[PDB]
Amino acid sequence: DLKAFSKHIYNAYLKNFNMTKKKARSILTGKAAPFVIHDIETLWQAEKGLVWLPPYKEISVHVFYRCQCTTVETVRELTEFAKSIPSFSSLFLNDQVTLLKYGVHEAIFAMLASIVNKDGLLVANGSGFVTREFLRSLRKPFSDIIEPKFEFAVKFNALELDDSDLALFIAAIILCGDRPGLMNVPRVEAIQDTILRALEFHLQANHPDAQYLFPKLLQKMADLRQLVTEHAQMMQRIKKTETETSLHPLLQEIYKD
Numbered sequence: 001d002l003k004a005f006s007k008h009i010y011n012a013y014l015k016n017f018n019m020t021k022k023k024a025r026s027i028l029t030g031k032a033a034p035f036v037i038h039d040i041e042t043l044w045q046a047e048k049g050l051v052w053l054p055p056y057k058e059i060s061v062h063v064f065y066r067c068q069c070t071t072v073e074t075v076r077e078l079t080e081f082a083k084s085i086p087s088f089s090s091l092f093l094n095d096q097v098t099l100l101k102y103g104v105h106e107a108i109f110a111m112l113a114s115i116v117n118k119d120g121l122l123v124a125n126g127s128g129f130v131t132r133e134f135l136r137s138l139r140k141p142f143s144d145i146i147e148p149k150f151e152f153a154v155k156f157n158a159l160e161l162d163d164s165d166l167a168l169f170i171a172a173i174i175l176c177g178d179r180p181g182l183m184n185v186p187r188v189e190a191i192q193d194t195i196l197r198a199l200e201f202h203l204q205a206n207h208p209d210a211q212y213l214f215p216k217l218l219q220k221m222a223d224l225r226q227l228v229t230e231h232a233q234m235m236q237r238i239k240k241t242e243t244e245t246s247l248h249p250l251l252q253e254i255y256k257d
Ligand SMILES: CCO[C@H](COc1ccc(C(F)(F)F)cc1)CSc1ccc(OCC(=O)O)c(C)c1
Pocket: 037, 043, 062, 063, 064, 066, 067, 068, 070, 071, 074, 108, 112, 121, 123, 130, 135, 145, 146, 149, 235, 251
């Protein structure tokens, strides 16, 4: 009943996300190799065929838009993921939307670490590997909202979670009971309570030697809330100073507050 729960969440995660941390760690290590993107030339080569939108303006903004395309696809998967949780789908549709609105970016940044290492991150289903040196090389606004994700991603991967753990972690992130405008708060805190109790139970079997892992994850959850807050501010500034830069409508609604 409680392991049936974690098993169900683990299947929805497997079923709804094309890139898992298992696949990702296979590619980064070398089981099988992706095409390295580290400057204008290699990005263009990847943009043709090889690896793979508004009109191309500059490099820093071109990456920005690719970030948005990736964000939009993950938001699609996370929506199907949340819906595959029967308890979730039983909330009223407007509560479902409030949960996703304030949850996806936290979840997205949590899952980013699965496809990241100290040197770069996988893109397009793992066919390419954008380097961190390149992303530091971008213009001053756009190179700022990427580096913190690495800093978080490296400290998150230090915990050595696997996909079975992450499925519950993400589910816990989405079913947050203190999201602004939630209609039926107690029902959401109840589901969240089941998820965390399932997560803590699962961490015992899967990580028998992990000292203080569950409380640490809960700390990572709060750290993600802060990363998203800081990420959102840079985005708003980008909206203000980069008046010629676009924002995909779906992302406009999420941040609309
Ligand atoms: C969700 C994955 O997207 C990023 C990965 O970074 C990439 C870097 C380079 C490239 C490519 F080289 F292919 F252009 C793609 C993604 C993670 S960081 C991020 C995430 C979202 C972003 O804006 C959209 C939003 O806030 O909803 C921005 C500006 C950055």
